Amino acid sequence: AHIEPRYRQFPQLTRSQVIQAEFFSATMWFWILWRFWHDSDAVLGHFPYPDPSQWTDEELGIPPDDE
Amino acid sequence: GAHLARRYLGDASVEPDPLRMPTFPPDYGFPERKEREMVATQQEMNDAQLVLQQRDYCAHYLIRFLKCKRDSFPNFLACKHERHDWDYCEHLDYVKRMKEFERERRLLQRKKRREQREAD
Amino acid sequence: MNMFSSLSLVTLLLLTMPIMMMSFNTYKPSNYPLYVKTAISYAFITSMIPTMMFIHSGQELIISNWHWLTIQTLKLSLSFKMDYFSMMFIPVALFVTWSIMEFSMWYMYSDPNINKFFKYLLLFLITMLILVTANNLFQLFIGWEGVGIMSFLLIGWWYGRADANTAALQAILYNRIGDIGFILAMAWFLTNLNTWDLQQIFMLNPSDSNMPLIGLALAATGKSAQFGLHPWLPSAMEGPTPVSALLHSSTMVVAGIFLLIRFYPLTENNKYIQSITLCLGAITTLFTAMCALTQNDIKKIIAFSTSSQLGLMMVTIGINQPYLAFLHICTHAFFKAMLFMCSGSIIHSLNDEQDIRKMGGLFKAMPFTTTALIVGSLALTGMPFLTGFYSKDLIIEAANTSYTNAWALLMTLIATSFTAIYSTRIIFFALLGQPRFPTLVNINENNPLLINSIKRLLIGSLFAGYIISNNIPPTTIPQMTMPYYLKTTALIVTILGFILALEISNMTKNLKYHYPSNAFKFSTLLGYFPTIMHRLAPYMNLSMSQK
Amino acid sequence: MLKYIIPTIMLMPLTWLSKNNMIWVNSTAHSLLISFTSLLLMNQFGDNSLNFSLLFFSDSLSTPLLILTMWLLPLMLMASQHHLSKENLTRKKLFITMLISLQLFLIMTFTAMELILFYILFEATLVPTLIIITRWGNQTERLNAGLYFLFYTLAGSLPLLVALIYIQNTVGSLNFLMLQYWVQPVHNSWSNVFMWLACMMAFMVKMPLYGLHLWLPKAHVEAPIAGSMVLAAVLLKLGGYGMLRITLILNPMTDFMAYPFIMLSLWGMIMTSSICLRQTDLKSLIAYSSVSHMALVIVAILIQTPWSYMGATALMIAHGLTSSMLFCLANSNYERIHSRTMILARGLQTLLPLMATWWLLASLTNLALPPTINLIGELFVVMSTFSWSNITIILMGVNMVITALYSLYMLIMTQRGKYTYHINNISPSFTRENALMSLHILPLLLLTLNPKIILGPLY
Amino acid sequence: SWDKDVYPEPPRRTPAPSPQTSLPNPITYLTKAFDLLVDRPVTLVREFIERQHAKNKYYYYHREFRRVPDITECQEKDVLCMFEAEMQWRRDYKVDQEIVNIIQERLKACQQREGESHRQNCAKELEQFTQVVKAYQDRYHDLGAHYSARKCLAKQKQRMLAERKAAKEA
Amino acid sequence: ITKDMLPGPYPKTPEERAAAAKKYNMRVEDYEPYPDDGTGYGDYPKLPDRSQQERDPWYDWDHPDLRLNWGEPMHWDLDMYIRNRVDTSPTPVNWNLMCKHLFGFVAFMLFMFWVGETYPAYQPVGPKQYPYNNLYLERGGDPNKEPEPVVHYEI
Amino acid sequence: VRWTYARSAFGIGPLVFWYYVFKTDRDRKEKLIQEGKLDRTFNISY
Amino acid sequence: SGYTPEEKLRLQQLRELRRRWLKDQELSPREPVLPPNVIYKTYRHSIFAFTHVLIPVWIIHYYLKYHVTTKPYTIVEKKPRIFPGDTILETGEVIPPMKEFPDQ
Numbered sequence A: 001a002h003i004e005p006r007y008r009q010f011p012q013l014t015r016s017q018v019i020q021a022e023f024f025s026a027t028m029w030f031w032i033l034w035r036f037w038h039d040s041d042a043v044l045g046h047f048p049y050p051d052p053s054q055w056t057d058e059e060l061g062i063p064p065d066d067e
Numbered sequence B: 001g002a003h004l005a006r007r008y009l010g011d012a013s014v015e016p017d018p019l020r021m022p023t024f025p026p027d028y029g030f031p032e033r034k035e036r037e038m039v040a041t042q043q044e045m046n047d048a049q050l051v052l053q054q055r056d057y058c059a060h061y062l063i064r065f066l067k068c069k070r071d072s073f074p075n076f077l078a079c080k081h082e083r084h085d086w087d088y089c090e091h092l093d094y095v096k097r098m099k100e101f102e103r104e105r106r107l108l109q110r111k112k113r114r115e116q117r118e119a120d
Numbered sequence C: 001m002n003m004f005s006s007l008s009l010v011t012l013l014l015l016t017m018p019i020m021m022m023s024f025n026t027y028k029p030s031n032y033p034l035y036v037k038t039a040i041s042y043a044f045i046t047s048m049i050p051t052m053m054f055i056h057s058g059q060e061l062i063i064s065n066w067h068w069l070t071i072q073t074l075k076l077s078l079s080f081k082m083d084y085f086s087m088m089f090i091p092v093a094l095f096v097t098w099s100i101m102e103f104s105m106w107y108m109y110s111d112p113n114i115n116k117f118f119k120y121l122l123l124f125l126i127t128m129l130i131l132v133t134a135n136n137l138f139q140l141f142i143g144w145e146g147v148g149i150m151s152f153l154l155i156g157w158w159y160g161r162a163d164a165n166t167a168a169l170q171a172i173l174y175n176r177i178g179d180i181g182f183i184l185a186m187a188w189f190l191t192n193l194n195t196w197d198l199q200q201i202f203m204l205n206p207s208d209s210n211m212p213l214i215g216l217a218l219a220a221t222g223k224s225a226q227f228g229l230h231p232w233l234p235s236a237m238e239g240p241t242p243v244s245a246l247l248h249s250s251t252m253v254v255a256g257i258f259l260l261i262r263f264y265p266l267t268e269n270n271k272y273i274q275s276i277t278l279c280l281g282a283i284t285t286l287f288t289a290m291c292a293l294t295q296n297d298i299k300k301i302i303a304f305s306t307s308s309q310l311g312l313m314m315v316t317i318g319i320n321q322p323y324l325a326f327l328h329i330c331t332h333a334f335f336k337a338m339l340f341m342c343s344g345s346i347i348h349s350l351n352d353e354q355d356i357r358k359m360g361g362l363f364k365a366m367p368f369t370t371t372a373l374i375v376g377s378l379a380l381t382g383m384p385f386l387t388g389f390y391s392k393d394l395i396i397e398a399a400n401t402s403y404t405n406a407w408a409l410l411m412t413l414i415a416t417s418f419t420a421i422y423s424t425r426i427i428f429f430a431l432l433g434q435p436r437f438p439t440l441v442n443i444n445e446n447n448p449l450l451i452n453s454i455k456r457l458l459i460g461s462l463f464a465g466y467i468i469s470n471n472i473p474p475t476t477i478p479q480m481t482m483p484y485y486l487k488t489t490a491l492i493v494t495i496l497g498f499i500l501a502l503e504i505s506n507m508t509k510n511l512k513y514h515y516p517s518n519a520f521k522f523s524t525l526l527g528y529f530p531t532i533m534h535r536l537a538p539y540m541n542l543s544m545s546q547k
Numbered sequence D: 001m002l003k004y005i006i007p008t009i010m011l012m013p014l015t016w017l018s019k020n021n022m023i024w025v026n027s028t029a030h031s032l033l034i035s036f037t038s039l040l041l042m043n044q045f046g047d048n049s050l051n052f053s054l055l056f057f058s059d060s061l062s063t064p065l066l067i068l069t070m071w072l073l074p075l076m077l078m079a080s081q082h083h084l085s086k087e088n089l090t091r092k093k094l095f096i097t098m099l100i101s102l103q104l105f106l107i108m109t110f111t112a113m114e115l116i117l118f119y120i121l122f123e124a125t126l127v128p129t130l131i132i133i134t135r136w137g138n139q140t141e142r143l144n145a146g147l148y149f150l151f152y153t154l155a156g157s158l159p160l161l162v163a164l165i166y167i168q169n170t171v172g173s174l175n176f177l178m179l180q181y182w183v184q185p186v187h188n189s190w191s192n193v194f195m196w197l198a199c200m201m202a203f204m205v206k207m208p209l210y211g212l213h214l215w216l217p218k219a220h221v222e223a224p225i226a227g228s229m230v231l232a233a234v235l236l237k238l239g240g241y242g243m244l245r246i247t248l249i250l251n252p253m254t255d256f257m258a259y260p261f262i263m264l265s266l267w268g269m270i271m272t273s274s275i276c277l278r279q280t281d282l283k284s285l286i287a288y289s290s291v292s293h294m295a296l297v298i299v300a301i302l303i304q305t306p307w308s309y310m311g312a313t314a315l316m317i318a319h320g321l322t323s324s325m326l327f328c329l330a331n332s333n334y335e336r337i338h339s340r341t342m343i344l345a346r347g348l349q350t351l352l353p354l355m356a357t358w359w360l361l362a363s364l365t366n367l368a369l370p371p372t373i374n375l376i377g378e379l380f381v382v383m384s385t386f387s388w389s390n391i392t393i394i395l396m397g398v399n400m401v402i403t404a405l406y407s408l409y410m411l412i413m414t415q416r417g418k419y420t421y422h423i424n425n426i427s428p429s430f431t432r433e434n435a436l437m438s439l440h441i442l443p444l445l446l447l448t449l450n451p452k453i454i455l456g457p458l459y
Numbered sequence E: 001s002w003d004k005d006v007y008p009e010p011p012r013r014t015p016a017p018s019p020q021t022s023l024p025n026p027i028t029y030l031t032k033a034f035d036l037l038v039d040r041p042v043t044l045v046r047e048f049i050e051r052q053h054a055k056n057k058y059y060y061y062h063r064e065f066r067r068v069p070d071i072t073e074c075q076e077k078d079v080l081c082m083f084e085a086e087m088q089w090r091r092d093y094k095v096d097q098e099i100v101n102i103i104q105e106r107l108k109a110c111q112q113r114e115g116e117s118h119r120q121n122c123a124k125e126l127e128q129f130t131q132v133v134k135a136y137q138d139r140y141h142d143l144g145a146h147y148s149a150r151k152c153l154a155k156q157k158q159r160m161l162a163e164r165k166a167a168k169e170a
Numbered sequence F: 001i002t003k004d005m006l007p008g009p010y011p012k013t014p015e016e017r018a019a020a021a022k023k024y025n026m027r028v029e030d031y032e033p034y035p036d037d038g039t040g041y042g043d044y045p046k047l048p049d050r051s052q053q054e055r056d057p058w059y060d061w062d063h064p065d066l067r068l069n070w071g072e073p074m075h076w077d078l079d080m081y082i083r084n085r086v087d088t089s090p091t092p093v094n095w096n097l098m099c100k101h102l103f104g105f106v107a108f109m110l111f112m113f114w115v116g117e118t119y120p121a122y123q124p125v126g127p128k129q130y131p132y133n134n135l136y137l138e139r140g141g142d143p144n145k146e147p148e149p150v151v152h153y154e155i
Numbered sequence G: 001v002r003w004t005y006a007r008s009a010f011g012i013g014p015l016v017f018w019y020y021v022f023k024t025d026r027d028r029k030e031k032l033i034q035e036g037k038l039d040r041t042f043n044i045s046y
Numbered sequence H: 001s002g003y004t005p006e007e008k009l010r011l012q013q014l015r016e017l018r019r020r021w022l023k024d025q026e027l028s029p030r031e032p033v034l035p036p037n038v039i040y041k042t043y044r045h046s047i048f049a050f051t052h053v054l055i056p057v058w059i060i061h062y063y064l065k066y067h068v069t070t071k072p073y074t075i076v077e078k079k080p081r082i083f084p085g086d087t088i089l090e091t092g093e094v095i096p097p098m099k100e101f102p103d104q
């Protein structure tokens, strides 16, 4: 047993587990920031969404009210 | 959307019915429309084995993207431009559908306005 | 095709070699579990070569190699369908199983029947690969019932415990109810068509497909534990933790969803079956998420997390997005298998304690388990660009913009918010706070088998979604134009779930005396479905038998 | 068929002329050789049957039943010798002689051309059967309880004899090959209704049909292990084999005369499976399990479609090997605890690890796990009865659920849980017992590789 | 190997490789590794076996069944003529089961081969399968487990009577 | 076992009721037969209808998994009350209230799903347009015929 | 022993019910087949 | 509310025997009496690849190439996708391009 149990105390830790836990915690955040920088559209929106109240009658081909 | 509250809570008479529209002649109100032009031939999509739902008015941009996807492997990051052209061409198609819905709604209001202009 | 097909079968044949060698061929019971892990690891490599060829040029095959039986005008052969779904699912399942087997090499170390445990996991994997690659319904049935029996033998692993034998028999009962739907489809396809082959079924493409598709929906309802046939999946926690990791990711529970994906050429043109599976999935995704809010057993929470995610998969089937349903099966297998391996790491350290009320203060005590649990939790809750986001995010966008049942859509969005609540519940009570576990501390996650097995899945839970979604070919037209408030709906309700869960968790610390609620008891006791159904239904049947 | 009749008879001189301590060795060895030569019957043809002579023939229906019959004699000898070891030598040879004579009547019964020759042998099999069950049975209770002998002979054997005698007068022959070409349709008529029942009631009781089945559980609780093996494996199939043959000359009256018997079978299929959940006696549980399985065979024979006849043949063989193995598994426990109660000895997997594997395999075949021929037969009958009426899928499906429930309940109660504390005489499984189980299951599983040789003539 | 007319397949059209990436294609390299480690050693073993086979050349034959009179020409209750006609009908029935199997195998091979275009490109296979299944159903469906030439003929004459009657109605 | 230690006919007289009570290792005041009818219970005791899950798990039972002592009379439906089957333990919520909340939840969700079909959600867009006469030929349409054309216009 | 001795020592109604369920179904199905109104285009297994 | 004097004495006497019994379950040093670095990991892996990959694929390739593929429709490929501008290997054919796209 390279780790002795303790009584009512915080367990003994190794450096290897702490470093690896930090490397993969920091990898997760690097990946999220790296992708958000390059693919922010995937979260906010790829293309503009038109407002149909703006389209004119000419382009929608709506005849005048007296025709 | 707000359009659903209008049709279910407000007046449904002046709201396009999604399952039956368009309910007006396509020419009506248009001095000579142009037909939609399809670039990819019908045998080309058959050879490319596109999914039928994908054989729409954008299939030429998908045929291009699928060709580049094959020809750039292993590089699975090699076709962002071909992919975006297909995506954009689909966005423009979706907007065209959004115009048809608005055109159908505006006309349904013109009919209503004219029906109640008469009885008045 | 000579290399594609040869390497497609060696992967299946290779997995059976440790089974054949059990007949004392150079047998080395010293390290049979290591031998099984190695075979899976090599099976993963060989399976990745056909996958690359499919990724490259979309190459696909059917291999009907052995003619088994002819019944007049119904020829039955051993036929493997090595297509899109088989290409991509097999490497994922083998990758996940490889980590679970290395984890089991440590978790099950002291079990005297260690060798028998690994043989059962290998058979449990083989019957799943028979299922996915099956090209006719009969061969699909062999795998379909195959996983069911291995579920029974692994759930009831500790066979001196009456609760384990009761949960093993419960899985069989609920699954054989679903198999009534499976045989109904087989009977209908044989009669109205003249085949059990998927090729002739899709070629004929019946329109009057209500009956065979209700049969498949029922079969998927039991196998993937949708509402109505759902209580067995939480009960299946009686099995050893490595069993739950496999059961809830790369094998049994996704078979029900996989079956409906196989038959998407039929469900495409049946708005009636689409409406049934949408509503069926929508209640499941919510109900099971609501149950998970008040559970205290760590394995029970994750088990309800699975039912809630399987419900979302069933919703995706019902909005006519079968390829997003498959993409979720693949991604979900990564972070869900990891969460079970993180729970087992905690359970093992605390001497077989599974109640989160007796955990706490583990954030620093178990640093690598903490890192994987946080990554797993964020991937489950659709944190942008982790493995879970590439499927969940598109599914919510596709559900929002479809011609859909309005109530099913609202129930699907609330279930997404609840996902953030019970995920927080695990992190808050297991990792934060002060320790609430006994005084003799045996916390030790320093084992290479534990570290390596979790590490590989952690890497998958980060990049697997991105790598897969960038390699699979387009089979649909993804709908990318849509209002901002529909685009960001999944992220927003996820964030409000996290905010809404911190307040609930923090109020547990106030020195105020709780008061039980009707809603709380409803969620704690699983809506009373087990208490009523599992007492009343056995009573009526068993009392009916004697008289 | 004389190459099987004559060697079978020669087992009697062999048994009576062996050294005193070689009776089991000698008869088992030579009866296994007869079983080996029975595989030459699989010289079947697509169009014609194997018609040896004026008396005997074989086709794809009788051939698998003959092979099963000849396989079972050595297995019965292996299963019987432990509990007959304290029996004196002259009574061991009489017991063996009863088994040999039972095989002699069975192989002749399955191959007879003439239906009257079939009738005499079909009844002669009861003489060795009742002697074995009563003379070597457990208790003083009468298997032929008097009521059952009367009901069967009055409502079964006698009406069948008169119907067969009547048919030969009208047709001029009862040779089955002739009946295939000279068969005439049966018109609606009160007299014809009674000919139909007369031709069928005897086989319905032997199957047994639900409502006429109470005799079977009683017989199993009394019989010695060999009796239960032959009774479950073969003797029930005599009724099934008879119906598959005699229905040739009963059309089209079977179109409507079969409804009550289909209803009894479809409902009784579920009622007997449920009874298996509340049985306290292993031999009774397996007996009620046989009633449930034979309900499918009756339905399959009565709807008479190509798929149901293929399913019926597969079911009869699969049940024969599975129910026989279940009785042997139960008997091995009984030879230690001397009780048929299923709750008495529990957690046996702890004490007998390999025997628990035989139990599991026996239970998986019983609940019809794919691709075992147990399922192949059951699936074919399910497929055919769905066409007969789609609603039947509900009853067929529910029975599949219940069958899985009592199969695993039997496995769980006896093999799992905590062992019983005071039972301290569970000795390790003998080589004889392990070999007896493996000779049941290995052929049963090997047939999955080549199912066509058990699918009958309709294949 | 088989007969190309019975089990037809259209000519294969595989596009030439047209790479557009400087990265090596790992599939092409694995293909050479396969063609060297697997195919050639396998081919050598087979060629040796086929050498032994060429030394010993013996032939087997496909049995031919001369035609005999059908059940329609048999006298009533004349078993000698009914027997041969009955056996011939069973042989034809078994052959017809395999003709339907061939047509189904074409239909299934077509669907997989055509991929996403199968609905249009397998219409000829679907039509042929439809007509053969119709013809088989006309002959042999609903005869029962105790089918025979006699019952097949009774079904046909009943169908012929209905066809003849509907002609008058016309 | 003798015939006097076995189940017998229904007890008529208090003397017999005592004899059966002793036969079953029960005291006379505890013993009661089932109602005398055609059910055929005989003189077998009618014991409380409770599952074995209600019995003291800590007591040193002779049969620990069945929680039964040796010589103790076995409830008639015992095999239905073993720890693997029917359980009758007291529930934290009254049985009747549990049924109303479960059924009320299923009833309210089924109703709401019906309303969701009646008033579906959808986006404000016209139908998706396809070329070549709505893909008449691709969808397997008959090529000997000519479809009545479908024309799509630019907007 | 006493327990298993006692243990080892609705009716037609469901049969009548199921008779009418199946008899009615098969009469409706039989009528449709004679009127050609039942789809059996690909049904050749039975 | 505690142990009676006899209860303590019986417990003590069973403690002596129970603890002696458990001590007797320990194994003697001789028991059981049985009857009569990169390269290593590479050799174990190299021998595993040979026995569990190379031999199986030799048998599978032989089986497919000479026994399965020689029967019709046993291995059915999906036909390769042909895109405009391709060159067919079998015939040398040249698939034409698509029309000129409108500007976008």
Ligand SMILES: CCCCCCCCCCCCO[C@@H]1O[C@H](CO)[C@@H](O[C@H]2O[C@H](CO)[C@@H](O)[C@H](O)[C@H]2O)[C@H](O)[C@H]1O
Pocket (backbone or CB within 6 Å): C013, C021, C025, C026, C027, C028, C030, C031, C032, C033, C034, C035, C036, C038, H044, H047, H048, H051, H052, H055, H056, H059
């Ligand atoms: C379909 C036909 C297939 C034909 C297959 C022909 C058989 C070829 C296999 C021969 C060698 C098998 O060898 C079998 O597997 C591995 C090989 O390392 C051995 O296992 C060995 O390696 C593993 C790890 O690699 C160790 O955990 C184990 O301690 C060690 O003994 C088994 O103990 C041996 O029984």
Ligand SMILES: CCCCCCCCCCCCO[C@@H]1O[C@H](CO)[C@@H](O[C@H]2O[C@H](CO)[C@@H](O)[C@H](O)[C@H]2O)[C@H](O)[C@H]1O
Pocket (backbone or CB within 6 Å): E056, E057, E058, E059
């Ligand atoms: C598992 C073990 C089972 C053992 C029992 C089965 C094995 C028996 C194998 C014997 C097979 C012999 O098969 C036999 O081969 C010889 C090869 O010359 C053929 O011989 C014949 O063929 C051709 C011309 O006809 C000539 O080459 C030869 O002169 C001629 O005699 C026979 O026509 C064939 O029937």
Ligand SMILES: CCCCCCCCCCCCO[C@@H]1O[C@H](CO)[C@@H](O[C@H]2O[C@H](CO)[C@@H](O)[C@H](O)[C@H]2O)[C@H](O)[C@H]1O
Pocket (backbone or CB within 6 Å): C286, F097, F100, F101, F102, F104, F105, F108
């Ligand atoms: C995602 C949204 C989910 C929302 C689901 C909402 C529907 C589920 C409703 C379950 C509760 C129904 O509640 C129904 O009325 C009350 C309690 O409410 C119960 O009856 C009784 O309950 C409690 C306790 O006795 C009393 O306070 C109440 O006054 C009384 O009526 C009924 O037995 C039940 O039928």
Ligand SMILES: *C(=O)CCCCCCCCCCCCC
Pocket (backbone or CB within 6 Å): B001, B002, B004, C400, C401, C406, C407, C409, C410, C486, F112, F115, F116, F119, F121, F122, F123
């Ligand atoms: C407008 O954009 C429609 C699509 C967005 C989600 C609609 C939300 C539906 C609200 C719940 C109504 C439930 C009725 C049963």
